[PDB]
């Protein structure tokens, strides 16, 4: 019924209005204090430098550089692969449609945080030292 | 104003920068010379640039 509407209890509030009477607590000064730079219209100092004493991010030195040929791969741990069934050809094309990889940046890399507990053959661009021994111990192969 | 008769040479505008990189407007005029060239009618003295004078030209 459009004549009986109730919002969820605790989800709506009324805004605050300063400078409307004295009983509200936000009257003459309107929550700014007495005279000063932080009381005039137009804000105050910038948190970046604010003048005065030397700012923080001008007393510390710069560091490092940025690589342009930087490569970054997605990561699929072992506890994510155990949702598949035994005897499946895992392929970078399948991992996208399966829903475990949303975006392959420059390839897929299989990390080894967990346990597989399943028999698969995994294809990827790169592998790990502890992720190649758990795929082949219980049976299976890994192909790049 | 003064403009080349053969081609479209004319003055331009840039900046005059000192050691302290202080900007001041200035002009860059073309090397226009007064020569008398053959015309289908009477030969007339017209403003011609020294670039058009080279490579051979009738005067």
């Amino acid at each position: 019924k459009l004549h009986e509407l109730k919002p969820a209890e605790g989800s709506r509030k009324e805004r605050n209005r300063v400078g409307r009477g004295v009983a509200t607590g936000n009257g003459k000064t309107s929550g700014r204090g007495h005279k000063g730079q932080k009381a005039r219209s137009g804000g105050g100092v910038r948190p970046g430098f604010e003048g005065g004493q030397l700012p923080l991010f001008r007393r510390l030195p710069k560091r490092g550089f940025t690589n342009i040929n930087r490569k970054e791969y997605a990561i699929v741990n072992l506890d994510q692969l155990n949702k598949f069934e035994d005897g499946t050809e895992v392929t970078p094309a399948l991992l996208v449609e399966s829903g475990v990889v949303k975006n392959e940046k420059s390839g897929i890399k299989i990390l080894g945080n967990g346990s597989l507990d399943k028999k698969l053959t995994v294809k990827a661009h790169k592998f790990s030292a502890s992720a190649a021994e758990a795929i082949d111990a219980k049976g299976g192969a890994h192909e790049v | 104003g003064k403009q080349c008769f053969v081609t479209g040479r004319k003055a331009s505008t840039g900046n005059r920068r000192s050691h302290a990189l202080n900007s001041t407007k200035r002009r860059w005029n073309a090397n226009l010379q007064k020569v008398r060239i053959l015309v289908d009618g009477k030969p007339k003295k017209v403003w011609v640039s020294a670039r058009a004078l080279k490579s051979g030209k009738v005067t």
Binding site: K1, L2, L5, K6, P7, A8, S11 | -
Partner: protein, 192 residues
């Protein structure tokens, strides 16, 4: 007849989602179309009225100041849109609540297909009274109905829509809902 889906008509209504879906629809056809003028927009007032000192008058810069009569508004209306959006999984949850509420309140009537081939308002008024329908009713069908939507559109309180055009506000307003057999099957598959 009684033809229900028993899935999108039986769920409990979500009052928190149903309230936010009605406020979204009403605020979406509010064309603001409202504007006033400020100091820069008011015509005139380019010179100082009198010198700062030498007279017993207050200091004034322009005859179009917010305190002067005839010029300058400080904070008035401005052209803006009021519409916002909500996730898709909350839109269908609000439609099922507007359809299940009618069933809980015993206000759903499943009628066979209409056989109206000519526009006649006096003829359509009879079946509304023959079926014991309330004052304000909603008519939902399969697709566009020429010679049917032409009628029932001059009767005060009667609204006819389509199967793909159901609204949270158009449904909550009607007392009872009248749907055909082909329509109730189309609504049961688009929802849920």
């Amino acid at each position: 007849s009684i033809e229900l889906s028993d899935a999108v008509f039986g769920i409990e209504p979500n009052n928190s989602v149903l309230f936010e879906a009605i406020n979204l629809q009403r605020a979406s056809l509010r064309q603001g179309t409202h504007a006033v003028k400020n100091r820069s927009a008011v015509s005139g007032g380019g010179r100082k009225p009198w010198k700062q000192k030498g007279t017993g008058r207050a200091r004034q810069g322009t005859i179009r100041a917010p305190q002067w009569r005839g010029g300058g508004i400080v904070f008035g209306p401005t052209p803006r849109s009021y519409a916002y959006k909500m996730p898709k999984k909350m839109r269908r949850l609000a439609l099922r609540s507007a359809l299940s509420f009618k069933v809980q309140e015993n206000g759903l009537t499943v009628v066979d297909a209409f056989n109206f081939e000519a526009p006649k308002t006096k003829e359509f008024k009879n079946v509304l009274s023959t079926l014991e329908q309330p004052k304000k009713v909603l008519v939902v069908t399969e697709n566009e109905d020429v010679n049917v939507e032409l009628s029932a559109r001059n009767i005060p309180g009667v609204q006819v829509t389509t199967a793909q055009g159901l609204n949270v506000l158009d449904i909550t307003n009607a007392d009872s809902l009248v749907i055909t057999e082909a329509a109730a099957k189309k609504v049961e598959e688009v929802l849920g």
